[PDB]
Amino acid sequence: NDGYFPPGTSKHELIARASSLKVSEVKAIIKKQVDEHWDVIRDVCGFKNKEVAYAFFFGMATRESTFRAATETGSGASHAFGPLQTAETAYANANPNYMPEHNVPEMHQYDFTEYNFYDVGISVHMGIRHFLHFARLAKEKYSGRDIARHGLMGYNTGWIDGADESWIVRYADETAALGAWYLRNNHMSDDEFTWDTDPRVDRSNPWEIYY
Ligand SMILES: OC[C@H]1O[C@@H](O[C@H]2[C@H](O)[C@@H](O)[C@H](O[C@H]3[C@H](O)[C@@H](O)[C@H](O)O[C@@H]3CO)O[C@@H]2CO)[C@H](O)[C@@H](O)[C@@H]1O
Ligand SMILES: OC[C@H]1O[C@@H](O[C@H]2[C@H](O)[C@@H](O)[C@H](O[C@H]3[C@H](O)[C@@H](O)[C@H](O)O[C@@H]3CO)O[C@@H]2CO)[C@H](O)[C@@H](O)[C@@H]1O
Ligand SMILES: [Mn+2]
């Protein structure tokens, strides 16, 4: 039951309706997916509880889209849509040159179709799956916070290793810090959001809250 909008909704309407979703509604979509997939999320990432897992994915929504669910960027393998900026590489049958993601059997891999790419519900499901693809690769060589940290580097770059430490900080550590703002300031359900570089956000020891 992953799709949010009616099957058959046009591309234009999927985008327009995503654009009009309230922040609280995007948070609810993310929570639904985290609830549905908690066991695999916990097994891969070792997050302490569902609440901090919600916050982690709110951090991703913040870093990727500033909670603007109709955000669309990139080209080819980087072409991404939705609150988590789910790339085409997440999807089954998208392009023969995309590296396969057959290591998350706990989550269905939706086919690459207009509805599956542009529906916010499918997009969020697939973003979580795509992140777990890379986090599971990271767990082969990393532990603790480094699973999620390098999983995020894979999500954004295609590669769990080899990014600059300064992008690990500006992208992955930023994501962790942004997510914690929601938990610490009672924004887990309301329409409030933070943003990349917001000076209010506490960036010290940004991973500790999750474990
Ligand atoms: O490269 C990582 C991801 O970046 C996403 O873009 C984000 C920008 O990196 C981020 O700086 C920007 O933050 C803005 C915010 O949108 C604005 O409202 C505020 O006033 O200033 C902030 C700092 O400049 O947010 C965008 C996301 O909305 C890409 O969308 C994503 O594809 C990419 O992976
Ligand atoms: O050399 C190995 C194979 O590489 C394939 O290209 C991959 C890029 O190397 C990788 O950087 C890119 O990663 C995407 C990522 O999947 C996505 O989530 C993010 O938004 O954008 C990243 C790029 O900025 O994925 C591609 C495809 O898997 C070549 O296509 C392949 O021929 C080659 O064998
Ligand atoms: Mn799902």
Numbering used by the authors: 140 to 350
Task: Pull text from the paper.
Unusually for R. thermocellum, RtGH124A is not targeted to the multi-enzyme cellulosome complex of the organism but instead consists of a ‘dockerin’ domain which instead targets the enzyme to the cell surface of the bacterium, followed by a CAZY GH124 catalytic domain; RtGh124 is therefore an unusual enzyme if its primary role is in cellulose degradation yet it is not part of the cellulose complex. Here, we show that the metal-ion site of GH124 can accommodate a variety of metal ions (but not Ca2+) and that the histidine is modified by a carbonyl group at C2 to make 2-oxohistidine (but only at a fraction of approximately 0.5). Metal binding also occurs with a stoichiometry of approximately 0.5 (in solution by ITC and in the crystal through occupancy refinement) and we are thus unable to deconvolute whether the 2-oxohistidine is required for metal binding or antithetical to it.
Manganese is coordinated by Asp141, Gln172, Glu175, His176, His264 and a water molecule. In several structures with other metals, the water is at a very low occupancy or is absent, while Glu175 is often found in a double conformation, with only one of its positions coordinating the metal. The reasons for this are unclear: it may reflect pH, the partial metal occupancy or histidine modification. High-resolution structures of RtGH124 (1.40–0.94 Å) have revealed an unambiguous modification of C2 of His264. Occupancy values were similar for other metals under similar conditions, varying from 0 to 0.5 for the histidine modification and from 0 to 0.8 for the metal.
